[PDB]
Amino acid sequence: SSYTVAGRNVLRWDLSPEQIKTRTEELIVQTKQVYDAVGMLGIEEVTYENCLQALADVEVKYIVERTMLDFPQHVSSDKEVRAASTEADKRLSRFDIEMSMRGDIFERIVHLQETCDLGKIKPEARRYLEKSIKMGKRNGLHLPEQVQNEIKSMKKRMSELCIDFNKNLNEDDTFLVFSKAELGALPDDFIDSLEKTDDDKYKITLKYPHYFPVMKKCCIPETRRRMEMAFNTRCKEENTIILQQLLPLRTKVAKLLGYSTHADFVLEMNTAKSTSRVTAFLDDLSQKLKPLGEAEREFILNLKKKECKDRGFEYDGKINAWDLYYYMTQTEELKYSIDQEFLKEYFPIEVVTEGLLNTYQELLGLSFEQMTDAHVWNKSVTLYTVKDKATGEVLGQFYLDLYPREGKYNHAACFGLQPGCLLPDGSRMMAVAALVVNFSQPVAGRPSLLRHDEVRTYFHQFGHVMHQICAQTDFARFSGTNVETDFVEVPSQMLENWVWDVDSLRRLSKHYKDGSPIADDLLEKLVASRLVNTGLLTLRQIVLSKVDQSLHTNTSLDAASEYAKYCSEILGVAATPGTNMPATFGHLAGGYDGQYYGYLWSEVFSMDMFYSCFKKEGIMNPEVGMKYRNLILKPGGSLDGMDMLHNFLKREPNQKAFLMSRGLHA
Numbered sequence: 001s002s003y004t005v006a007g008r009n010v011l012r013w014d015l016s017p018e019q020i021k022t023r024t025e026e027l028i029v030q031t032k033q034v035y036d037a038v039g040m041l042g043i044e045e046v047t048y049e050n051c052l053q054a055l056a057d058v059e060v061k062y063i064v065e066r067t068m069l070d071f072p073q074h075v076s077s078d079k080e081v082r083a084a085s086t087e088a089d090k091r092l093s094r095f096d097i098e099m100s101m102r103g104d105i106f107e108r109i110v111h112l113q114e115t116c117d118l119g120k121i122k123p124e125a126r127r128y129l130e131k132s133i134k135m136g137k138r139n140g141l142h143l144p145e146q147v148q149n150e151i152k153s154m155k156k157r158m159s160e161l162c163i164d165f166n167k168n169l170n171e172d173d174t175f176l177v178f179s180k181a182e183l184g185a186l187p188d189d190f191i192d193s194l195e196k197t198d199d200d201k202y203k204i205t206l207k208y209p210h211y212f213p214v215m216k217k218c219c220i221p222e223t224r225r226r227m228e229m230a231f232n233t234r235c236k237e238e239n240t241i242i243l244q245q246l247l248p249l250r251t252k253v254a255k256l257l258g259y260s261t262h263a264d265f266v267l268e269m270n271t272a273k274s275t276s277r278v279t280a281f282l283d284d285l286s287q288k289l290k291p292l293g294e295a296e297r298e299f300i301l302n303l304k305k306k307e308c309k310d311r312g313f314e315y316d317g318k319i320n321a322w323d324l325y326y327y328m329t330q331t332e333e334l335k336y337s338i339d340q341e342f343l344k345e346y347f348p349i350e351v352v353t354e355g356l357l358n359t360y361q362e363l364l365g366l367s368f369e370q371m372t373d374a375h376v377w378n379k380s381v382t383l384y385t386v387k388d389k390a391t392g393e394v395l396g397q398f399y400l401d402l403y404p405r406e407g408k409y410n411h412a413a414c415f416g417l418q419p420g421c422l423l424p425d426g427s428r429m430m431a432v433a434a435l436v437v438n439f440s441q442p443v444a445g446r447p448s449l450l451r452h453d454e455v456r457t458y459f460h461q462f463g464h465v466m467h468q469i470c471a472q473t474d475f476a477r478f479s480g481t482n483v484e485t486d487f488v489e490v491p492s493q494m495l496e497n498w499v500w501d502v503d504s505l506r507r508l509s510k511h512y513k514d515g516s517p518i519a520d521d522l523l524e525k526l527v528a529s530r531l532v533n534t535g536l537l538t539l540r541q542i543v544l545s546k547v548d549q550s551l552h553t554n555t556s557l558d559a560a561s562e563y564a565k566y567c568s569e570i571l572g573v574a575a576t577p578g579t580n581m582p583a584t585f586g587h588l589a590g591g592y593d594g595q596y597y598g599y600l601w602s603e604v605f606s607m608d609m610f611y612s613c614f615k616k617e618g619i620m621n622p623e624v625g626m627k628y629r630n631l632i633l634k635p636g637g638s639l640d641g642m643d644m645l646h647n648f649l650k651r652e653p654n655q656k657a658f659l660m661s662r663g664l665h666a
């Protein structure tokens with residue numbers, strides 16, 4: 001039933017290494033049986049029930065079983081279960097490539113479109129049919145069989161390269177060792193948490209909770225230099241080898257499919273449509289931010305000269321990559337009176353989580369209840385059940401996995417586990433999501449204290465959770481977050497706006513000892529500090545967006561060189577010789593390849609919506625929140641992104657709101 005919880009979460013995290021391997025093969029047997037059945041049908045005999053429905057039914061069954069097999073590599077504490085899940089993921093990705101490239105299925109899907117009365121099927125059924133054919137042509141099934149086989153050969157190779165690129169980064173355990181003197185100006189609560197080694201020194205990993213606090217706060221520039229050198233050479237040798245194979249393969253395949261470049265190939269499936277529009281979007285936006293960057297660079301450089309004079313260090317006359325976060329943090333302290341180590345005392349994990357959940361219950365018309373003694377992949381992970389408030393309909397569940405450990409995904413993300421789609425049964429399948437982040441854990445009496453950007457990250461991922469859960473579609477491939485890649489960061493970045501509002505921030509905050517609120521004064525300063533460093537922060541995102549495009553267009557260019565070019569030309573902060581940032585750039589192997597612009601692309605749509613509707617009619621208004629839920633979250637990828645923006649805005653979007661959020665004009 002669509003009004004109940006029990007029996008609707010089919011997922012299990014019991015699995016032994018043998019159980020993953022055996023179920024991978026079983027799943028392939030069961031799924032291939034359906035594709036064989038559809039392929040065996042005569043061309044004249046195919047119909048909705050035995051071809052279209054049969055494939056869509058098995059897609060649901062496949063995707064659900066697959067996430068019990070491919071997800072444990074990201075969250076299990078057992079190393080052997082992670083490797084089995086990894087090897088399962090590689091196998092199943094080769095299986096996907098085989099089924100996607102079957103000419104007999106593609107032949108029958110095309111025949112069904114010409115002969116079937118397209119007006120009698122649902123609009124999303126027409127979409128399934130149009131997209132399935134589009135995929136077929138994008139997999140080269142219109143080309144000769146000898147070309148198809150070559151394309152297949154390279155796609156299997158590219159899959160394994162992509163999986164190896166990210167595995168190398170998650171499995172990395174590079175550390176550096178420093179004395180107490182070398183970690184100067186880092187707080188005691190940071191340094192006491194670190195592991196002591198021989199010769200009374202401390203161990204610093206290159207993880208996000210270690211790296212950024214050192215680069216932000218450490219006052220010894222040699223320490224910052226060594227940490228940045230280490231961070232931007234993680235997996236250098238092995239992932240440089242991967243990129244040198246990966247990028248030319250992407251080109252070679254794209255050219256065989258009839259595209260000039262790989263960037264052109266991916267852009268066709270995005271709201272931006274074409275690489276010309278992306279290049280124009282980034283160059284135009286780079287131009288507008290240029291004066292902000294020039295001003296921010298000049299203030300930072302003056303500030304360095306003062307600190308170098310005061311502390312008596314040598315002054316090299318430039319902003320190095322290792323100086324960038326340090327003086328950006330310091331600019332925030334001087335201009336907005338914000339100490340992030342003071343401010344986090346007001347954001348304890350329990351108070352933030354409660355505040356976050358209360359915010360979006362009210363806004364989106366939902367009810368969350370935590371489940372007790374829930375089946376989970378770790379003791380520290382919790383499970384919540386999402387209900388519609390008015391109807392009482394059970395929309396989905398989400399897991400919260402907030403704390404770091406050995407083997408876990410290093411970065412912030414949201415994973416789709418179950419789609420919110422129709423079954424063969426006729427009933428609705430319950431959506432399931434996992435919020436994955438890395439904030440400190442409670443030590444003794446001191447609880448987990450969140451910095452403001454950690455709260456924002458928490459809100460970011462919860463935007464993906466709500467998208468995954470509120471999305472109700474007929475078919476599995478359109479459900480949840482399966483939208484255009486350059487649209488998928490609309491719902492996530494949207495929710496970040498509630499972390500820059502005074503009323504919302506007061507609702508999210510409480511001091512951990514005495515329970516006092518943040519001062520009215522300091523809340524104004526926090527909301528006003530949104531603009532601080534915005535030039536260089538946005539300019540860095542343009543560098544990455546530009547690099548990502550360049551590496552997927554002209555693929556006879558050195559990746560590190562290309563990064564250093566845009567670093568100097570756009571950001572005005574040089575990449576340090578010997579470091580290759582692209583080799584660490586996990587988005588290039590995690591499905592944002594040629595699509596990293598999508599963050600900035602989406603932020604235009606998120607700000608335009610936030611300013612035009614939410615900020616006008618009150619940011620906690622249920623009618624606007626329900627209008628957002630129904631028009632943006634609910635359809636999933638069953639409609640185009642730009643149509644879903646049109647339905648909400650009643651017009652095409654524009655950059656006015658985005659530009660106002662940066663402090664510009666048009």
Ligand SMILES: [Cl-]
Binds near residue numbers: 145146149
């Ligand atoms: Cl052949």
Ligand SMILES: [Zn+2]
Binds near residue numbers: 492
């Ligand atoms: Zn995101």
